[PDB]
Every structure is written in C-alpha cells, then in structure tokens.
Amino acid sequence: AEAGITGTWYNQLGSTFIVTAGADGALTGTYESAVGNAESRYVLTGRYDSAPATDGSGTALGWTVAWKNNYRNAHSATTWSGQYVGGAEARINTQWLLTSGTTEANAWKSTLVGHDTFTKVKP
Amino acid sequence: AEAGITGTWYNQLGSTFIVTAGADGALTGTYESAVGNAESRYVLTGRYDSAPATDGSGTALGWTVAWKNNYRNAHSATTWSGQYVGGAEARINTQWLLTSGTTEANAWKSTLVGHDTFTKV
C-alpha cells in the first residue's frame, strides 16, 4: 500500500532511503550514503506493483540510483529489486546490481551483486 | 546428448574449459585462462543432472574454480550455473558468481556476477 512504503528506511550498512510512493505506482526519493554528512544524497526513482495480492504476500518494487550528484560522480548506477512486507515491523528485502561504466575490456567485471534489507523508521 | 558435455569448450573471452562428465553426475576438468599460457590452468569440479528430462530441455549443471594453482593465488573463486543444450551447435549457457576473499568492511562488494556462453568452436 503506498503509505506503508512511504517514509524513511535504513539498511544494515547505515544508508538512508527516503521514499514517497504515489498512487500511480511511482517511487521518488533520495538515497544517502552510510553516515558521512549532507552531500551524500542522490536521487532515486522506481516503481512498485500499487495493487499487490490478500494475502500475506509482499509488494514487488524496484528503484535505481545513478551515483552522480553535484559533488561526486562515481560513474556507476545501482538497481534494487525486492518486496515490501508490512506489519508493525515492516521491511523491504532486496537483491541489487551495481554496474560501473567500463571500457570494452573490463566489461566482464562491471557488475557487483548483493542484498540489503531495509527497516522503516519514520513516515 | 548426455556425455556430449565431455570435450573442450571455449567462451567469448578466450578461456578454454576441458571437462569429463562421469555417468553419475560428476564434472571434472581444467579451466585455463588468457594467452593459453602454461600455468593459467586451474582445476574445476562440478555436477550435472545425469538423467535430464525427456520436452527438449537442456541439462542443468554447474562447477567451481578456485583461482589458485602452484604459480598464482587470486584469493577468489567462481561458480558457473547453467544448462547444456546439445545438437549440431552445442552450447553451455551460464551466469556466474565470482567472490573474492575480503575483510568485513569490503564484504558488501565481494561478488561480481556475469554470464558466459561456451561452444566447441
């Protein structure tokens, strides 16, 4: 449900995700690096599936962050794909792909894979 | 066909893979890297499914290579997961995970993922 996803979330590395889910399935917000002052904020955009199932199933969603802002440019982009599971302890469980811009020759090792779980802290 | 997995395969990067498939599911062989070289060879071990389904499906398999031999140690290991499709143009289509030994702090970016298609040409 949009409300449930909207709010502030943190993951186990200490990064901050602030998102607003709109009624049309859109996701917009900011992502912040683990601790590290104010200019560690990047724009994110994503989509969620606004009519999940009844049942105790999660809501699929995904978003992207290109790591460039006015202070830094890490020439890479990450996409998180996962499910939102609500309750008193709502969580967003994801698997992510971080791709860096490489030359032809290093393309083979351009992508990293991992997983993060986000805990909601504020609405 | 079944032990059609046995032989020498090449991928798009130039790496060569030489494997023997046992009748009970084992996969054993050598993986050699760049240039051909001499000791660019590493041992590989895996398993395949020796009784695949009878709908034209491919044969599921996978194998691992630890990047250490008596000349080099890259403190990493790669696992390829995929399926074998035989025929006139046999291929092994895979996705792989390369994990490096890191310290806690670098654990979040310890794994790369990619895909390779191997053929006998």
């Binding site: 020759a105 290093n106 083979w108 090792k109 | 990067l13 130039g14 790496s15 890297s33 760049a34 240039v35 660019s40 590493y42 290579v65 990047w67 080099r72 890259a74 990493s76 790669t78 390369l98």
Partner: peptide, 8 residues
C-alpha cells in the same frame, strides 16, 4: 584476474 581476457 585469470577469469578475464588477456591483458595484451
């Protein structure tokens, strides 16, 4: 890395 292409 031994998994990649030649360094040539």
């Amino acid at each position: 890395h031994p998994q990649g292409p030649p360094c040539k």
